[PDB]
Amino acid sequence: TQMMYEQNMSGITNSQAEWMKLGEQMSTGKRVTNPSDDPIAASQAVVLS
Amino acid sequence: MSSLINHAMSGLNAAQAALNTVSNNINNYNVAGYTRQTTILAQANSTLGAGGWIGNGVYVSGVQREYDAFITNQLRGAQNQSSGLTTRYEQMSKIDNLLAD
Amino acid sequence: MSSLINHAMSGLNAAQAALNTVSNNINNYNVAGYTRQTTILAQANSTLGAG
Amino acid sequence: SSLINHAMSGLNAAQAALNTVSNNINNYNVAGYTRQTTILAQANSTLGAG
Amino acid sequence: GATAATFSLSFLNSMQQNTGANNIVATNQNGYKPGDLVSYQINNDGTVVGNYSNEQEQVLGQIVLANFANNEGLASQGDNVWAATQASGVALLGTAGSGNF
Amino acid sequence: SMQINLNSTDPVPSKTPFSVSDADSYNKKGTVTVYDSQGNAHDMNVYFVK
Amino acid sequence: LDENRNLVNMQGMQLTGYPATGTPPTIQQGANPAPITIPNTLMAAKSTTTASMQINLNSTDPVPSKTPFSVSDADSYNKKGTVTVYDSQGNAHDMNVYFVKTKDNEWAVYTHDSSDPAATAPTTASTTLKFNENGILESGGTVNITTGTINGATAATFSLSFLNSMQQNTGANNIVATNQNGYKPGDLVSYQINNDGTVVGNYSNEQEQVLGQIVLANFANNEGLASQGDNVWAATQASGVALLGTAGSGNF
Amino acid sequence: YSNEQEQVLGQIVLANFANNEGLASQGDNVWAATQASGVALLGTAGSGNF
Amino acid sequence: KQLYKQQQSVSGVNLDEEYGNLQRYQQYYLANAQVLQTANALFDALLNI
Amino acid sequence: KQLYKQQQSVSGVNLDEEYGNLQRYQQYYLANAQVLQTANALFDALLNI
Amino acid sequence: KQLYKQQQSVSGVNLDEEYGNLQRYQQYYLANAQVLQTANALFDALLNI
Amino acid sequence: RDQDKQVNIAIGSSVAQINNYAKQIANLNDQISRMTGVGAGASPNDLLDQRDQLVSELNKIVGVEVSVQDGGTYNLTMANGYTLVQGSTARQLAAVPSSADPTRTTVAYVDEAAGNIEIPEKLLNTGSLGGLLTFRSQDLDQTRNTLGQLA
Amino acid sequence: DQLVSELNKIVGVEVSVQDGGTYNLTMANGYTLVQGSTARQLAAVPSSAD
Amino acid sequence: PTRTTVAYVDEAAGNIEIPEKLLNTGSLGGLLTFRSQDLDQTRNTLGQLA
């Protein structure tokens, strides 16, 4: 039955996607990359650059 | 009397029909597009007549399509909203990745 | 009565639903904003036979 | 009869789906291979049965 | 182009604090828009209640039940439904609070 | 009907009288919606002061 | 059904009933029952002669820039209604409805016969409609168009009304209703017998025609009725004579 | 076609009768035309009464 | 997804539930079969004279 | 930080009681399913009569 | 590199949903097998008489 | 500009997609009409399901209200109140590069009265293609011209 | 509730449960933000003060 | 008026605040007592020091 499969499977998916992001930042070593990582302070980063 | 044979055999017809409804229910459960189909059938209840409570009236009524049409169309509207928001956010992501670079 | 099977199906359904709930406590776990969700159980309605 | 036909045709679909998932998961790493999914549909349900 | 509504606006239960803090929290209002929506629920006794496109609630509906002087006397010959009989007494109507329902 | 509760010890603001966007000359904004003769809708906005 | 498609018993004895006649076909009690049959024929060319739609509206729209509306004035009118119709030969026309408004408890309407290239869209509002501050439509409920003859077919003529709409207290212009009496003809594939004794067929115009009802006999003394073999009774003096009524006629 | 092209040619004729049960079978999965069945009424698939 | 969950809660099918439905109808069928068997027995018994 | 943790104390998934619960309810589900089989044996015997 | 990420994020095969499908259709197959066997059983129960 | 032509091509294809869905919906509508005419109250619920689910599929591309005929079938209304279907019939929708501002692709829809439009994209607020359109209008053009202005 | 918590963390705000397109959502000057469709859109401006 | 306390609303006459001396019980009685002694006394002590 669908709802249950979707529930747990998407649980796995979002748990992975979370880990994926933590993995992204950890592997790269940058807390901030883009409007999705910093819609706000990156502008001041440009200024200070 | 021997109509009992018939009577019972109408019970058999009801069982077979219920079985086919069950069969379509189970076989199509994962089909993209399906709704539960419960079987329906009558009773030899207290409708008036001239025979009394003899085995007059048990037979298969048909099958329904159990779907909340009201929330189904409301769901189509919600799908319109999601379509718009999701579409434009993906197109946003396309630029976002380059400013990510 | 169809009671014999119905008891079992009632309990089976209730157990499965409670399973979904406790899962929902697990699946979120880490994400901030969530609060633990707890479940209620009770007897079935009184088609009491004859008392 | 028709009930067994239901039983079996669903078996056919399940076998096809298993074939598809095995196909994909085995082919998973090949450059140029795109994921593929198998879809279901109902028979030519037409009425003379009342 | 509609009527300019006129009304009495009452500051009920305001109070003054020797030692308190300030806020305005209440509203009563007895008007609502023309309804245009399909939204209702049935609940516990044959009464029907719904939420409405005024974003709020109303109650309108009831289903009437029947009982006879002597239950088993009914017509007893068909089709999932009953008919009254002189042996059973003619129907007394009710909704389910009064013992016989 | 709308309710208001306040503290008595306040330094009454120096606006004589209040103005619709002079912020010191009101304290909290309360709101009352209303509907006319046969159900056309309106909303009414209020300001309060000491 | 026999090769004449007349209803018969196994011996060929005819099944009799009361027939439907005229247009609309109605079961005429003013006849005597006769064998009922199924003609293999198409449906009547039921032209459109009336129409109605309901229009619950906000009456605050400012003057659109490109008034009047005739053909492609997409900056001149605020809402579209449509009702498809059939000329009096039975062929297909569609009517389109367009709404234009600067009258602040009211609305005005343009119209066109939008299958007709010979006729051309009128360049002026065809009708004006009224509402009151009590959130209710009051008047304006008439307009007609004659679905212009094109291919030698007789043009049909209809009248259209807009009664009993409610008013949308702000913004939410709305329209929900469709009515028109007519349909094109169409061939027949359906025949059904029902509990009331009636016999109905259905046509590829996606609509219906009825021709048939079965009438039953009743008697003062059943014991007089005599089988003639082949499960057929001869109504006898010993039984009285037939009293006729269909199922639901009280005692039937 | 073996030259990356398509052509269409084919359509069968169907039969429908006044008195289906009256149909004169011959055995061997076949029927024939008769008066009692009514003369044959022809058509194409999905069209009208077909 | 919430709307989907509720619509499916009405429409979808649980494998558990139908298996239960399946078993009942076995009871129903065999019960009717028993009935016809006893009727056959009484029929022939009557004909014995 | 302290008050956030105080909120978490009530709200936060504790991950131990829930795990133990997951086991406990699997047992309940099995208990239900097996009981069904017993009723099946009962009406099996009744049918076989 | 970025556009390749797009292409393979949409097109690539995973391991998760394929795994889930494998079990879901295993279960579906077994259920249809239940149907097969029980249906023939009921037919034979009838056929004996 | 590559992304610009991508959105152009995508909308062009979407035109064909909606046309296909319209044809399919019309076909199934014919089927249910005739089959319930024969049915005597029949319940070909499978046909019902695929018909309405195909409708739901189309809705995403362009927000829809599937407006009903009396008992059998529908006429198809887009969210603005435009409508294009009749029973088993679905009219054509076409792909056109714009004559209004020729650096874009767009769709054309027809009313059988006299002629077709090159759609006034003001209408196109509906979810998917209007989702693409709003991107193009507000988001794409603004940054495009900001970049050009700075350069 | 989490969204309003963050909205608070950027700019002080009241938070109490109700509806009406509105919320118990006063902010730094007794003025109220959210009502019906008119959730107020604030501005960044050159300053008449300085 | 600084405080909240519990009452039975004998709606034929009105709300009567049942004197707080009476609430010895565990959860609610304990919370009432907790304010009564612990928090009010502690704030009094804090203020006395200050």
UniProtKB/Swiss-Prot annotation, chain L:
Cellular location(s): Secreted; Bacterial flagellum
Family affiliation: Belongs to the flagella basal body rod proteins family.
Protein name per its UniProtKB record: Flagellar hook-associated protein 1
Organism in which the protein naturally occurs: Salmonella typhi
